[PDB]
Structure formats: structure tokens, C-alpha cells
């Protein structure tokens, strides 16, 4: 059935369930399918008319290698996307004659990480149950990821989740989503320290091998194969709305750690006809500079109005590097060794050409992003958040061809009201079902920034 191999070539070859629990490989690499499941044009035509859930079952099942029985998989996919307050799950809104926005923000935290998290948490619950295990999920957030994680893992049977965030330094909306979920297996830890301090405590816990063992610790991050896998689906559903497979479709993705756009690459590898895949970056433009020059070189991180894309390095870019080098693990090891030692590497000509043959990249500054929010509101009556506006700006600059362009809208404007207001004067409004959010009771524990204090809290409260 399906096996999973590391980008660094010397880790155990794993089945789906293990790849899901392993996370990062033994050799320091990232897991990828040994081969991609394939869909012919007729097999894609056969998806026409199907619900989001039905397309998800078709597209994702081959990746699970027969390890999750069909009835169980078509409960957990149904339940995952039942949390999205939109019948289409991820609907298109047309913004110009050949341009559409794919709204990934109808889920429980109004942001695109819900798509993968809501299924990942259920798949993990199932795998753990099947092995008679439990897990203690631990992560640090500046606000947004923690919410998505807590809304996904809240109320799962086999996990307890602990998210550390900086006391007094999270936006009101973001904090309330972490702390008012009402679930008994959720623990929001407000650390008397900054985001970097929260990350250091998490790294501390993961380095404490006895602690990890005793608590069955597992991480929240962008590099597990199951944060990426579910995202393949909406490339299919969007492209089917626009006539797949009989015409190719292009996508622009506001991109930070590359997992989103890598899922689009995966869709293409599976047979979805895709013309352009366009990386859209903020002022932290390592990926844009990489496509221009081949020089993936770390520079200082700028704070922008699209903070979820404020990256120094792109955590899943390594997955594309592996594919671009024809799965030459030694080449990938070399480049990553270079990054670690010297802060950059240069991609050689053949793999760089392979990347450029399928991807392009552009950037949007804070002012350009604001200008895009204001013009799209003015011309269409349509309100973008800043991350999504980056996508629209870059899509319009970089699009080439006759294919329809789908721009991924990765957050609701109400998630970043300051930047939206600054750009266009509108104070965005929360969806009606969330209109009470600011009145929900918060419930969180303030802890000092000390590894032993946090470990004791986790030890006391985890059921693991
Ligand atoms: C995480 C995030 C991105 C970047 O996603 P990657 O898969 O890491 O490239 C873009 N926009 C928003 C709103 C996000 O939360």
C-alpha cells in the first residue's frame, strides 16, 4: 500500500499511520509518499457533482494505505468538514472575469489551518486508539496556530493539548479562540514571557526525553505530512468547479512554510491539470529571492501586516527541493547542511530549472498589500485580509496565460482587523455564528517562564 520516505534518505520507510505519528524523520528529513496516487482525466471527470467530503475521500484515501477502514475514514472526514460553516466547505467568489478567490476561512478559527487540523486531529485520534495509546500535544503560538490546534484537538478522546502563548501579548480575538473553547482536554498556558520564550519552553520539553516518553509528547507543526495532505483536496474541488480536467487551472498561494502550495504541487503530481503555481510572499521574501537567483539565503525577519507569513525560512520547501533534485537525498542533505552552517545555499542549475518550470514567485510590501485591499473593496465590494490580499496582488502581477486564476484566501478579514481598517477604513465584522466571541468566558492558567513549572502542569493535567 502507501509507503513514506524521508527527504534525507536514511530514515525508516513508514506506513501512513506511523508517518502521521513519527512527524519529522529519524534522519532529520521530512516524509513524502514513495509514489503519488494517480487520477486519469476520466477519474477526475468522475468527481464532478460530488460534495467536498466525497472529493476528499476520493483524493485522500490512497494516501492512507488501507490503514483506516472506509467507514471510519468517512465518518472522520464528514465530521472534520461539518465544522466548516459553508455547504461547499471551501467556496469560490469571483473577483474578475478570469479570477476567483478560494475562501479557506469558513472553519472554526476563520483561517486555512483549520482545513488540515480538523482532519489531522481526528486521524490521529483514530491511530492512537487503534494502538491503545494516548498523546500529549504541546505547542507554542503567537496567537493564530494555537487557536486552530485547540479547535481541532478539543474534545478528541485520546489527546490532551497544551498551547503556550505570551501573557498579554496575543490579540483579543486570537486569545479568546484559544481560551474559550470549553473543552476539558484543552489547556491554554499564558506564559509570563514572550513568544520566543514560549518556543524555548516547548523545545525544552521535546529535548527532555524522559518527559516526552512519560507523557507521549507530540508537536504542533507545519512539517507533519498530515498538515499537508488534507490541503490537496481544495485544489481538486476548486479546479472541478472551473472545469477540470478539460482545462488547466492556476493557483496563487500566500505562502509561509510552503505546505499549502506544496499540496497544490501534490495535486498536480496526482494528475490535476495545473498551469501555474505562484508563491506569494510578504517582505520576508526568501522564496521569491530563491526563484529569482537560486540563493536561498536567510535574512532578518521583518514584522509586516501578514504575520503568518513572517518567515525566516520555509519549513516545507525541503519537500520541493527533494522532488526537484529527482529525489537525490545526498543533494538535499548537502543543501540543508549548508543552511545550518552558513545561513543559505545555492540551488544548482538542473533542479533550479525544474522548480522554475512549475513555480513562480512574487512579493507584496505592506503598502502594496493595503492598496490591494482598498482597490478590491472599491471595485468589487469584496473585503480581503492582508495575507489574502498578498495573494491577489502577486496573482495579478505574475499570472501568465489563459488559465483561470484561483487565489487562496487564507484568513477572514476579521482575524486581522487593524491592518484591514488601516488599508480601507472598514472594521471587518465576525461571522454571525461567532458574533458572541468577545463575551465567551476565557479559561487559562498563567505560568512563569520556567521549564519545570510548565512540565509539572503538563504532568498533572495530561491523561497520557
Ligand atoms: C500559515 C498561513 C499562511 C502560510 O501557509 P504555509 O502552508 O505555511 O505556506 C498564509 N496565510 C495565513 C492566514 C496563515 O495562517
TrEMBL record:
Pfam family, one: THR4_C
Cross-referenced SUPFAM superfamilies: Tryptophan synthase beta subunit-like PLP-dependent enzymes
Keyword entries, A-Z: Amino-acid biosynthesis, Lyase, Pyridoxal phosphate, Threonine biosynthesis
Lineage start: Bacteria, Pseudomonadati, Pseudomonadota, Alphaproteobacteria, Hyphomicrobiales
Protein name: Threonine synthase
Domain Tryptophan synthase beta chain-like PALP: 102-329
Reported cofactor(s): pyridoxal 5'-phosphate
Pathway entry: Amino-acid biosynthesis; L-threonine biosynthesis; L-threonine from L-aspartate: step 5/5
Domain Threonine synthase N-terminal as annotated: residue spans: 3-81
GO biological process, one term: threonine biosynthetic process
Domain of life, source organism: Bacteria
Gene3D superfamilies given in the database record: 3.40.50.1100, Threonine synthase, N-terminal domain (3.90.1380.10)
N6-(pyridoxal phosphate)lysine (covalent) PTM sites in chain numbering: 113
EC number: 4.2.3.1
Residues bound to pyridoxal 5'-phosphate: 256-258, 260, 410
Reaction catalysed by this enzyme: O-phospho-L-homoserine + H2O = L-threonine + phosphate
The family this protein is said to belong to: Belongs to the threonine synthase family.
Modified residues annotated as N6-(pyridoxal phosphate)lysine in this record: 113
Gene Ontology MF terms in the entry: pyridoxal phosphate binding; threonine synthase activity
Keyword Lyase among record annotations: yes
Amino acid at each position: 500500500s502507501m509507503k513514506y520516505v524521508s527527504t534525507r534518505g536514511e530514515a525508516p520507510v513508514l506506513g501512513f499511520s506511523d508517518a502521521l505519528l513519527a512527524g519529522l524523520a529519524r534522519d532529520g528529513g521530512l516524509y513524502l509518499p514513495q509514489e503519488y496516487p494517480q487520477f486519469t482525466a476520466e477519474q477526475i471527470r468522475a468527481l464532478r457533482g460530488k460534495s467536498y467530503v466525497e472529493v476528499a475521500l476520493a483524493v485522500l484515501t490512497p494516501f492512507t494505505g488501507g490503514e483506516i477502514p472506509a467507514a471510519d475514514f468517512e465518518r472522520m472526514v464528514r465530521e472534520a468538514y461539518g465544522t466548516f460553516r459553508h455547504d461547499a466547505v471551501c467556496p469560490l467568489v469571483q473577483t474578475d472575469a478570469n479570477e476567483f478567490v478560494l475562501e479557506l476561512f469558513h472553519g472554526p478559527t476563520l483561517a486555512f489551518k483549520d482545513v488540515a487540523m480538523q482532519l489531522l486531529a481526528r486521524m490521529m485520534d483514530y491511530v492512537l486508539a487503534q494502538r491503545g495509546e494516548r498523546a500529549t500535544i504541546v505547542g507554542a503560538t503567537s496567537g493564530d496556530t494555537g487557536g486552530a490546534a485547540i479547535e481541532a484537538f478539543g474534545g478528541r478522546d485520546n489527546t490532551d493539548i497544551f498551547i503556550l502563548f505570551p501573557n498579554g501579548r496575543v490579540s483579543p480575538v486570537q486569545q479568546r479562540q484559544m481560551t474559550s473553547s470549553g473543552f476539558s482536554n484543552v489547556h491554554a498556558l499564558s506564559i509570563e514571557g514572550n513568544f520566543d520564550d514560549c518556543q524555548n519552553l516547548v523545545k525544552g520539553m521535546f529535548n527532555d526525553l524522559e518527559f516526552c516518553d512519560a507523557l507521549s509528547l507530540s508537536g504542533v507543526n507545519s512539517i507533519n505530512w498530515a498538515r499537508i495532505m488534507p490541503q490537496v483536496v481544495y485544489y481538486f474541488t476548486a479546479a472541478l468547479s472551473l472545469g477540470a480536467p478539460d482545462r488547466a487551472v492556476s493557483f496563487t498561494v500566500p505562502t509561509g512554510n510552503f505546505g499549502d502550495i506544496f499540496a497544490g504541487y501534490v495535486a498536480k503530481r496526482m494528475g490535476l491539470p495545473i498551469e501555474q503555481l505562484i508563491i506569494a510572499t510578504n517582505d520576508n521574501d526568501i522564496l521569491s529571492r530563491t526563484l529569482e537567483s537560486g540563493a536561498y539565503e536567510m535574512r532578518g525577519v521583518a514584522q509586516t501586516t501578514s504575520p503568518s507569513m513572517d518567515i525566516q525560512i520555509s519549513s516545507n520547501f525541503e519537500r520541493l527541493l527533494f522532488e526537484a533534485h529527482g529525489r537525490d537525498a545526498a543533494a538535499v542533505r548537502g543543501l540543508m547542511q549548508g543552511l545550518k552552517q552558513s545561513g543559505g545555499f545555492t540551488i544548482s542549475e538542473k533542479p533550479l530549472s525544474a522548480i522554475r518550470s512549475e513555480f513562480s514567485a512574487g512579493r507584496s510590501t505592506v503598502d502594496e498589500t493595503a492598496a490591494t485591499i482598498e482597490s478590491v473593496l472599491s471595485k468589487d465590494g469584496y473585503l480581503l485580509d492582508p495575507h489574502s490580499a498578498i495573494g491577489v496582488k502577486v496573482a495579478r502581477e505574475k499570472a501568465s496565460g489563459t488559465a483561470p486564476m484561483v487565489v487562496l484566501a487564507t484568513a477572514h478579514p476579521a482575524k486581522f482587523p487593524d491592518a484591514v481598517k488601516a488599508a480601507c477604513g472598514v472594521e471587518p465584522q465576525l461571522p454571525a455564528w461567532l458574533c458572541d466571541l468577545m463575551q465567551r468566558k476565557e479559561s487559562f492558567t498563567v505560568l512563569h517562564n520556567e521549564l519545570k513549572i510548565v512540565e509539572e502542569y503538563v504532568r498533572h493535567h495530561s491523561r497520557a
